[PDB]
Amino acid sequence: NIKVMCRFRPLNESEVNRGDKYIAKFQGEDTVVIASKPYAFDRVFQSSTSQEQVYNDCAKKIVKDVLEGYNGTIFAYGQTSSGKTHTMEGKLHDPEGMGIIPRIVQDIFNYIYSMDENLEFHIKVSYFEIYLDKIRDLLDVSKTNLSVHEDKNRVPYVKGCTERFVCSPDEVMDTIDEGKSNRHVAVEHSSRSHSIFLINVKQENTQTEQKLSGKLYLVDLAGSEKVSKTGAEGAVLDEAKNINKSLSALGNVISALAEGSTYVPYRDSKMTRILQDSLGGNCRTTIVICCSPSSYNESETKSTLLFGQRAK
Amino acid sequence: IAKPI
Amino acid sequence: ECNIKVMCRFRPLNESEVNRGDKYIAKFQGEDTVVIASKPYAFDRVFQSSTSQEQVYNDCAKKIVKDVLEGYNGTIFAYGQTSSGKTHTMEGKLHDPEGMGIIPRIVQDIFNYIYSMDENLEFHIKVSYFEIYLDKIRDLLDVSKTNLSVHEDKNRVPYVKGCTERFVCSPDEVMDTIDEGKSNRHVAVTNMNEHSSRSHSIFLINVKQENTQTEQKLSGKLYLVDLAGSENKSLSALGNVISALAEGSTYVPYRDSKMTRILQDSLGGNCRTTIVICCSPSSYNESETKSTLLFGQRAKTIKNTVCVNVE
Amino acid sequence: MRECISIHVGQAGVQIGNACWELYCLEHGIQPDGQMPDSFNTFFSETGAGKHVPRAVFVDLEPTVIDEVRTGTYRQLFHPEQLITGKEDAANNYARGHYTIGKEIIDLVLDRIRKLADQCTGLQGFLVFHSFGGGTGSGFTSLLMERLSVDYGKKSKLEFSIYPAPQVSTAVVEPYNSILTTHTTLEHSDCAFMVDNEAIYDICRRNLDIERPTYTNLNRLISQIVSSITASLRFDGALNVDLTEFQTNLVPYPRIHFPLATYAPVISAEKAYHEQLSVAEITNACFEPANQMVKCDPRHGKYMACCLLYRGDVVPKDVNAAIATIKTKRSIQFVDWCPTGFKVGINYQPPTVVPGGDLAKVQRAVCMLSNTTAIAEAWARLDHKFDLMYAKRAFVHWYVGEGMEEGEFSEAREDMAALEKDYEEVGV
Amino acid sequence: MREIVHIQAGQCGNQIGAKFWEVISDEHGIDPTGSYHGDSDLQLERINVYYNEAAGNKYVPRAILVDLEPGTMDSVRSGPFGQIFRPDNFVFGQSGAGNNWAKGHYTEGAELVDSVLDVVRKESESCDCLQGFQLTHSLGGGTGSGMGTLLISKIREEYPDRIMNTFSVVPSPKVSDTVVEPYNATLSVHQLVENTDETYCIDNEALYDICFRTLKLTTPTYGDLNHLVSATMSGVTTCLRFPGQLNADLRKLAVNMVPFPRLHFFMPGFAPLTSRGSQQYRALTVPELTQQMFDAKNMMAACDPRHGRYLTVAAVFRGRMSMKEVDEQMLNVQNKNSSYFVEWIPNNVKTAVCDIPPRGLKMSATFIGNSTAIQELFKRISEQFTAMFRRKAFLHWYTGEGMDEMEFTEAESNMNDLVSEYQQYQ
Numbered sequence A: 001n002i003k004v005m006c007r008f009r010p011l012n013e014s015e016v017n018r019g020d021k022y023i024a025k026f027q028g029e030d031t032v033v034i035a036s037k038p039y040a041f042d043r044v045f046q047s048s049t050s051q052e053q054v055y056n057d058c059a060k061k062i063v064k065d066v067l068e069g070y071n072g073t074i075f076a077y078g079q080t081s082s083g084k085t086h087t088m089e090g091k092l093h094d095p096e097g098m099g100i101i102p103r104i105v106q107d108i109f110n111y112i113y114s115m116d117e118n119l120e121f122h123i124k125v126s127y128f129e130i131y132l133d134k135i136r137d138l139l140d141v142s143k144t145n146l147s148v149h150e151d152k153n154r155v156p157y158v159k160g161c162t163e164r165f166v167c168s169p170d171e172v173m174d175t176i177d178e179g180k181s182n183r184h185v186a187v188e189h190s191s192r193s194h195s196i197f198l199i200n201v202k203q204e205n206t207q208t209e210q211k212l213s214g215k216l217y218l219v220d221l222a223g224s225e226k227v228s229k230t231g232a233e234g235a236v237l238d239e240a241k242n243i244n245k246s247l248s249a250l251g252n253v254i255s256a257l258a259e260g261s262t263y264v265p266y267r268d269s270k271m272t273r274i275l276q277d278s279l280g281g282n283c284r285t286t287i288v289i290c291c292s293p294s295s296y297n298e299s300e301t302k303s304t305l306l307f308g309q310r311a312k
Numbered sequence B: 001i002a003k004p005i
Numbered sequence C: 001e002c003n004i005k006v007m008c009r010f011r012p013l014n015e016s017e018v019n020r021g022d023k024y025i026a027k028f029q030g031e032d033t034v035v036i037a038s039k040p041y042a043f044d045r046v047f048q049s050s051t052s053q054e055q056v057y058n059d060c061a062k063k064i065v066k067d068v069l070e071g072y073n074g075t076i077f078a079y080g081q082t083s084s085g086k087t088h089t090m091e092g093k094l095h096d097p098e099g100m101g102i103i104p105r106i107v108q109d110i111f112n113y114i115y116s117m118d119e120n121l122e123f124h125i126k127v128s129y130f131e132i133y134l135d136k137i138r139d140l141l142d143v144s145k146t147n148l149s150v151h152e153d154k155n156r157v158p159y160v161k162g163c164t165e166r167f168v169c170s171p172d173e174v175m176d177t178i179d180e181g182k183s184n185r186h187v188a189v190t191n192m193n194e195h196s197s198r199s200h201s202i203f204l205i206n207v208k209q210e211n212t213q214t215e216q217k218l219s220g221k222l223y224l225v226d227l228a229g230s231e232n233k234s235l236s237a238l239g240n241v242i243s244a245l246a247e248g249s250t251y252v253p254y255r256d257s258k259m260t261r262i263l264q265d266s267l268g269g270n271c272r273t274t275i276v277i278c279c280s281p282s283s284y285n286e287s288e289t290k291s292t293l294l295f296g297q298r299a300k301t302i303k304n305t306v307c308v309n310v311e
Numbered sequence D: 001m002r003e004c005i006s007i008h009v010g011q012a013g014v015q016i017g018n019a020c021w022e023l024y025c026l027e028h029g030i031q032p033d034g035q036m037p038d039s040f041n042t043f044f045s046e047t048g049a050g051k052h053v054p055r056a057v058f059v060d061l062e063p064t065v066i067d068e069v070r071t072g073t074y075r076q077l078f079h080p081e082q083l084i085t086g087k088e089d090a091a092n093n094y095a096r097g098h099y100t101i102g103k104e105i106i107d108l109v110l111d112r113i114r115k116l117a118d119q120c121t122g123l124q125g126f127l128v129f130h131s132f133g134g135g136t137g138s139g140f141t142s143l144l145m146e147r148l149s150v151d152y153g154k155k156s157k158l159e160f161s162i163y164p165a166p167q168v169s170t171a172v173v174e175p176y177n178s179i180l181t182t183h184t185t186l187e188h189s190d191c192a193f194m195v196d197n198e199a200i201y202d203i204c205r206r207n208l209d210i211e212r213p214t215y216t217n218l219n220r221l222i223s224q225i226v227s228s229i230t231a232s233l234r235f236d237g238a239l240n241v242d243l244t245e246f247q248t249n250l251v252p253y254p255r256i257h258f259p260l261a262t263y264a265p266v267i268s269a270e271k272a273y274h275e276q277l278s279v280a281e282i283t284n285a286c287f288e289p290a291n292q293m294v295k296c297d298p299r300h301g302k303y304m305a306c307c308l309l310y311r312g313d314v315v316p317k318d319v320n321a322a323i324a325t326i327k328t329k330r331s332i333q334f335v336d337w338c339p340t341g342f343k344v345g346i347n348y349q350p351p352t353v354v355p356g357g358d359l360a361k362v363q364r365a366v367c368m369l370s371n372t373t374a375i376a377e378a379w380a381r382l383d384h385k386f387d388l389m390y391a392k393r394a395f396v397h398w399y400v401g402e403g404m405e406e407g408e409f410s411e412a413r414e415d416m417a418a419l420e421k422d423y424e425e426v427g428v
Numbered sequence E: 001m002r003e004i005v006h007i008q009a010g011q012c013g014n015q016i017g018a019k020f021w022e023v024i025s026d027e028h029g030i031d032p033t034g035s036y037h038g039d040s041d042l043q044l045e046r047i048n049v050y051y052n053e054a055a056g057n058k059y060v061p062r063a064i065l066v067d068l069e070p071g072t073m074d075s076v077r078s079g080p081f082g083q084i085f086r087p088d089n090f091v092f093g094q095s096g097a098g099n100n101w102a103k104g105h106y107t108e109g110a111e112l113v114d115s116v117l118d119v120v121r122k123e124s125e126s127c128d129c130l131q132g133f134q135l136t137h138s139l140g141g142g143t144g145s146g147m148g149t150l151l152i153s154k155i156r157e158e159y160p161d162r163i164m165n166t167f168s169v170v171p172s173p174k175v176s177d178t179v180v181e182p183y184n185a186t187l188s189v190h191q192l193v194e195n196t197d198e199t200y201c202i203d204n205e206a207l208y209d210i211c212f213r214t215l216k217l218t219t220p221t222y223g224d225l226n227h228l229v230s231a232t233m234s235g236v237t238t239c240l241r242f243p244g245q246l247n248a249d250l251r252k253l254a255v256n257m258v259p260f261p262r263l264h265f266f267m268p269g270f271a272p273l274t275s276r277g278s279q280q281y282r283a284l285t286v287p288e289l290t291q292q293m294f295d296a297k298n299m300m301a302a303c304d305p306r307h308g309r310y311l312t313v314a315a316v317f318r319g320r321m322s323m324k325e326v327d328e329q330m331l332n333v334q335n336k337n338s339s340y341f342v343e344w345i346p347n348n349v350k351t352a353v354c355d356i357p358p359r360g361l362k363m364s365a366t367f368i369g370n371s372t373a374i375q376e377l378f379k380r381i382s383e384q385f386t387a388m389f390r391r392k393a394f395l396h397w398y399t400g401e402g403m404d405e406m407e408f409t410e411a412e413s414n415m416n417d418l419v420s421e422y423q424q425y426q
C-alpha cells in the first residue's frame, strides 16, 4: 500500500537572527496544521527525531522485502534547504550521522554476511537521470538518448544502461559519488533533473535450484517551481515546464493507484513508465517529503504539503 | 566477466 | 575416448651432475623418439634442453584451453625429481614474459580469449590454491582451515571441502592471489626448498560460461598440480596404481592417499588427461630418468572417457 | 481636468471598445477622421491642428481583430502606436496569457500607458474591458492589473467583464480561467461590473422584439451603460456625481464591491409610441427580475445600496415620488442597517441614438447600479462546474505545461469560497 | 505570421494534397501559373499562411513532396495544378516501397530522410513565426506509414513545441487492397499515438457510404473522396486566414479538445451535403446544419457514434449567422442527447465562427469529434493482427530488413493500452 511520510527540521542559526517563527502546529503524531488548515498524513516527524527512527519506520520493511523476491520503491521530494540531502545522505561515515541510503546498503550487506555458504547472491547497480524528457546515463557520458522497451512478460526496462558489479559498500558509495558528479545542478546547488538508482539483488539456491530476483528503486524528485514569481528565461523556463509536467503526471499515477481505479495512466511520462513493475499491486512504495517550518519558506512548504497530500 | 559475492 | 598425452621436456644439467662427471647420453632420434641407456623411448612430443617455455606452451596447452572453453575438464600434470624442471616449467619467472611458465601463459591466453569473444555470454571465474604435505591438507587462503576432509558428491567424484573460494576478474588479481599463496606458504613452514621437494602444490581454476538468451550451461574444471621429488606413501600409491593400470589388473587403489582420489578425475575420470614429465639426460640421474620414462610410457597405455559438464 | 484611460484587452474587450468609441464619437459630434466642423477633454486630447486622438490602448496577442481595426472605418483616428499586437494568441490558456507569452509586450503597453498618463493633468481612473474565460482576458489582465497597482496604486480602477453563463457557453475550459481571474480581481480592482450573454439575449428577445441577436447588440448595450456612467463627468446637471462619490456611496465594506448593472428603457421603434415612458414607469421597470443583466433573481436576496443615474429631462419631484413608491413595496427587501439606500443623479444630456441601431430615441433613460446578495448564485454554479471538472483533473496538463503549479487552482477555489462566505455572512 | 509547413508522403497523401492545394488556390484566387487574380483584399491579407512570395507577383506553395517511386511525382507534375510547386522540393528515390513498413522505415527510408529534413529545414527557417506541421499519408501503405512516421519523429525531435497534425487514411474492415495491411496499421499507430499533437481518422468505407447515400452518386472514383478530405482539411484551419467573431487557432482546438495526452484521435465531418436536383428543396439554416452534422451517417469514420459517448466536440461555422442561434442549438443538442455525452464535462461542444463562407455557398461547417466509439476500429485492427501473428505469416519480409518480433509485441501492447484508455470512460 501507499505510505506518505513528512519530515520537519529545526531552524538553523543562519535564520534565527532574522527572527522567523514556527508556523507548523502538531496534533498527535499524524497531523500538521498550517494557517488553521489541517493536513492528514500517514506519519509526521519533528525536529527532535533522529535518523534511526525515520529509517526504521520508513525503509526497513521495503529493505526486507527486496531480499525476499519482492520489490519496492522510495522517492524523495522537497525544495532547496528543506532536508533532502540530510535525510538521504548526511554524513557518509558517522554511525549516527548517516541518512537512509547508507543504512539501506549496510543492511543489504549484513544480511548477505550471515547466510552460510550454500547460497549465492548477485548485486547490480545502475544510475540514470531524466533531463528534458530524455534519459541520460550518469555512469557513461557517451550514452545520451537511451530508450525504454518491454521484455516478453511486459515488465519494462531501459536498454543500453550501464550495469556494473559491486562487492563492498565502499564501492557503492564511490559509484554513488561519481554518478552524482554528472547530474545537472544550477547555481546554491539547485537540482534541475530527476535521478533514479537501482539496486538489483537476486538469489540462486544452489541446492534447490530456485531463483528469486528482487529490485529496489531510489528516486530523487526535483522541485516544482512557480515560474511567475521567479522570472526564469530561456533554458530555465524549459526545465521548469518539464519538471512541473512530470510531477503532475506522477501525482496522477499515484492517485489512480491509491483510489483503486480500473485504469492507471502508467504511460503518461517516462518516470512512471520505467517504474511500472515496482509501483503497484503487491509492491510497497514509500514517499518522504521534507519541509521547513520557517515563515520565510511558507509557500514552498505549502506546495510540498499539497503534493504529498495528493497521493492520499 | 561477473563478480559474484 | 580422449587420449592421454605424455610429454617429455628435458632440462640442462645442474652442478651436482657435472661434479659426478655426467655425459650427455640422451640423444633425440627425432622430436618424439629419444635414446637413453642405448634404448629408445618414444613419446608424443619430446622437448629439448634448449626448448623454451613458449614452445612447450604452443605445442601443448592450446587444446586443453580450448576444451575447458568448450566445457570439458582439463588436466596438466608435472612430474620429476627435485631439480628436474617442474616448478620452473610451472611458473619460472612470472614477471618475465619469456620465463613465465604454464600458469601465467594460461592466464594470459584465457584473458585474451575472453577479451576477444565477449559475446552474449557470462563467465564466472574462481580459483583455489591447495597443498599436500606429508598427507596434510592445508589451504593457504585461510591458515586456520587445516585437517580438512575430502567429500563425495552425487556423481561420486572426489572434491575438497573447506578450501576458500576467490573470484577473479583481471590477471593482476591472479598474480596477487599467487603472491598471497606463496607468502602464506612462507608462514608456518621452515624451509621452502625441502617443503617443495617433499610436498605437493595444487592450483585449481573453475569456469562457468552461460549464454544470456539461450541460457545454456557450460562448466569446466582445470587442474594444475606439481608433486614432490621422485628420489613414500604417496609415491608408493602412485607407482602401484600406474603399474596396475599399465597392466590393467584389479583396480586403482584410490583410498591409499588423498592425492589418489583427487587425481581420479585427472586420471581415468571425467577429465581430459595430459601430463608433462620433466626428465634429465644425466647419468647421475639415469636411475630417476629411467623411472620417469617407464612411468610415462606405462601411463601412455591408458585412455580415458570424458563427458561434457552440461546441466 | 477630469480624464480617464481606456484599455481594451482581448477580442471581447476590443469589440466592446469599438462600439464604445463609435458611441462617444457620435455623442461629441466628431467625424471618424478626427476633425470636428469643452466637455470632450475627458476622452480625447487636442493636437493643435484640429485632429483629436482618443485616450485608449488596444492590446491583443493575436493579430486578427486589431488588423480589422487598422484597416476598418476608424483607421485615421487612433494613434498607430496605441494598437499593440503580439504573435500567437493565448490559446485559452491562463498561463500563456499570464507569463509564457505575456512577457514580450507588457513593457510596451506599460510605456504607452505612462506616455498617456504624463499627458493628462487630473487623472480620474481606469476603464479596463476584458472577458472571463478566455486565456488573454483572464491571464493578461492579471499581469497588467498587478503592474498598474504597483505603479499607480491610489487611482481608482473599474472593469467590465463578460461572465460565463449558466447553460450557454462557448469554451470547454472556461471555469478554470474564470476561477483564476476572479481570484485575481479582488486584490487590485475597486468596482468590477459583470455581465453575461444569456440575460442580454433575453432582453433582446422580449423588449427589442429581435429573435436573432449577435454580438454587436450586446456591445451597444454595454457601451450605453458605460456612457451613462461617464455622462456626469462629461456634461453638467443638478445632482452630479463622479467616480469617488460613486465608490463611497456604493461600496460599504472593502470586499463587497461587485455590483450588477441595468439599463432602462430599452425599447424598439414600433413600441416607442403607445407608452408613456414616465419617470415612475422607468424606475419601477428597472427593479424587475427580468431586466437584470446577470442571471440571478434579486428576489432571492436583499439590496444594500442602489445608485440611480438619471439622464435627460428629469425633475427631482418625480424621482422622490418614484423612490417612495419603491420603498413602500414588499417584494424587494433592504438590509436593516442601511436606512438610506438610494443615490440620485440627474443630467441634462439625453441619450444619443446610433444610426442603424435597435435602440429608440427616447427623452430620458436611467442606469441603476446595485449590489445585492443575489450575485452569489452565479459564483456557486461556476464553483460547482470547476469542482466537477477538477475532480478528475481534466485539461490540467496544458496549464501545468506552461510553468504553473497545481496549488493555484486550490488556492483560487479557497479564495472564491471565502468570498461567498463573506458575502452571505454580511447579508444577514 | 503563423505559417504552416506541409508534407506529402505516399501515393494517397500526394493525391489528397494535390486536391487540397487546388482547392486552397481556388479559395484564395490564384491562377495555376502562380499569378493572383482574386477579387477581394481579404484573400491577399493572409496569403503567407500557405504561400511564399516571388518576383513579379508570383506565389509558390510551402509544400514538400516525398515518395520512393518516380511515378506519382511525374503524375502530379503533369496535372492541372502541378506547375505551381517548387521544383527543388521534389525529393524522391528509385526503389519501390514494396508495401513494407520495415523497408520504408529502416532501409530505403534512412537513405532519403536526410534530404527531406534538409529541405524542410530550409523551408522552416524562412518563416516569421512557425505554427505547426501538416502531413498527409495513409496508414495501410508501405512508404506512406513508414516515411511519415520517420519524418514525424525527426521533426518532433527538432521542433519540440509545435503543433503536429496529420490527416491519415485508416484501413477498413470490408474494403481492403493489401494482405499485410494490419501490420502496417499497428506499426504506424504505435508511433502516431506518441509523437502527434492531433490526428484525424478517415476511412474509405465511410466516404463510399457518404457518396452512395447522401450525394446519390453513380460511380464514385478517388477524386470525390480526395475532394471531401480536401474540403474538411480546408475547413479545419479557416480562422488563421480570415476574420470572424470568434477565432480559434490550432492550439486553441488542441487545448479545448484534448483532455488527456493520449486521446487525440478525431473523426472529421462536413456540411451541407446534397445531391444535384435536390438543393432547390432544402432550407439552409443553422438548425439544419446542426442536425446534419450530428448524424451518425455523416462522419468520415466507420465507427458508430451511438456505441459510445463524445468527449469533446468542436464545430467551426463559416458565414453570416446569429450567435444566439448557434448557442441554443449547441445546448439543445446536448440536452436532447444527454446519454450520448460524457456526464462530468459540462459544455462538451466548442463554437468557432468565421464570416468568410466558401465560394458558391452561404453557410458551411466542419465537425471535429472525439468519441469513445473509435475503440472498435482499433479492436478490429488488433484482432486481425492477432489472427495473422500467431502463425507469423508474411513475417520473413519484415525480419529481412532489420526488425524484430518484440517491435510487433510492443505495438500490440500499446494499441491495447489505448483501447483500454478509451473504454474506461464509457
Ligand SMILES: CC(=O)O[C@H]1C(=O)[C@@]2(C)[C@H]([C@H](OC(=O)c3ccccc3)[C@]3(O)C[C@H](OC(=O)[C@H](O)[C@@H](NC(=O)c4ccccc4)c4ccccc4)C(C)=C1C3(C)C)[C@]1(OC(C)=O)CO[C@@H]1C[C@@H]2O
Binding pocket: E022, E023, E026, E027, E223, E224, E225, E227, E228, E230, E231, E232, E234, E235, E272, E273, E274, E275, E276, E279, E358, E359, E360, E361
Ligand atoms: C449551384 C451550387 O450551389 O452548386 C453547389 C452544389 O450543388 C453542392 C451540391 C456541392 C458540389 O460539390 C460536389 O458535388 C462535390 C464533388 C466532389 C467532392 C465533394 C463535393 C459542387 O460541385 C461544389 C461547390 O463547392 C464550392 O464551390 C466550394 O467553394 C468548395 N469548392 C470545391 O470543392 C472546389 C471544386 C472545384 C474546384 C475548386 C474548388 C469548397 C469547399 C470547402 C473548402 C473549399 C472549397 C458548390 C457549392 C456546388 C457545386 C459546384 C455543384 C457540394 O460540395 C461542396 C464542396 O460544396 C456537394 O454537397 C455540397 C452542397 C452544394 O450545394
Ligand SMILES: Nc1nc2c(ncn2[C@@H]2O[C@H](COP(=O)(O)OP(=O)(O)OP(=O)(O)O)[C@@H](O)[C@H]2O)c(=O)[nH]1
Binding pocket: D009, D010, D011, D012, D013, D015, D016, D061, D062, D089, D090, D091, D092, D093, D131, D132, D133, D134, D135, D136, D137, D138, D162, D164, D170, D171, D197, D215, D218, D219, E245, E246, E247
Ligand atoms: N460581448 C462580446 N463577447 C465576446 C466577443 N467575443 C468573444 N466574447 C466572449 O468572450 C469569451 C471568449 O474569450 P475571447 O475574448 O474571445 O478570448 P481572448 O480574450 O481573445 O483570448 P484568446 O483568444 O484565447 O487569446 C466567450 O465567453 C465569448 O462569448 C464579442 O465580440 N463581444
Ligand SMILES: Nc1nc2c(ncn2[C@@H]2O[C@H](COP(=O)(O)OP(=O)(O)O)[C@@H](O)[C@H]2O)c(=O)[nH]1
Binding pocket: E009, E010, E011, E012, E013, E015, E016, E097, E098, E099, E138, E140, E141, E142, E143, E144, E145, E169, E171, E177, E204, E222, E225, E226
Ligand atoms: N482517397 C484516396 N485513397 C487512395 C488513393 N490511392 C490509394 N489510396 C488508398 O491508400 C491505401 C493504399 O496505400 P498506398 O498509398 O497506395 O501505398 P503507398 O503508395 O506505398 O503509400 C489503400 O487503402 C487505398 O484505398 C487515392 O488516390 N485517393
Ligand SMILES: Nc1ncnc2c1ncn2[C@@H]1O[C@H](COP(=O)(O)OP(=O)(O)O)[C@@H](O)[C@H]1O
Binding pocket: A008, A009, A010, A079, A080, A081, A082, A083, A084, A085, A086, A087, A189
Ligand atoms: N533533520 C535535521 N536535523 C538537523 N539538521 C538538519 C536536518 N535536516 C537538515 N539539516 C541541516 O540543514 C543543512 C543543509 O540542508 P541540506 O540537506 O543541504 O538541504 P539542501 O540539500 O536542499 O541544500 C545541513 O547542514 C544540516 O545540518
Ligand SMILES: Nc1ncnc2c1ncn2[C@@H]1O[C@H](COP(=O)(O)OP(=O)(O)O)[C@@H](O)[C@H]1O
Binding pocket: C010, C011, C012, C049, C080, C081, C082, C083, C084, C085, C086, C087, C088, C089, C197, C229
Ligand atoms: N629448463 C630449464 N632451464 C634453465 N634452468 C632450469 C630449467 N629447468 C629447471 N631449471 C632450474 O633448476 C633449478 C631447479 O628446478 P625446479 O623447477 O625448481 O625443480 P623441481 O621443481 O623439479 O624440484 C631451478 O633454478 C630451475 O630454474
Ligand SMILES: [Mg+2]
Binding pocket: C086, C087, C196, C197
Ligand atoms: Mg619444486
Ligand SMILES: [Mg+2]
Binding pocket: D010, D011, D062, D089, D090, D136, E247
Ligand atoms: Mg483572441
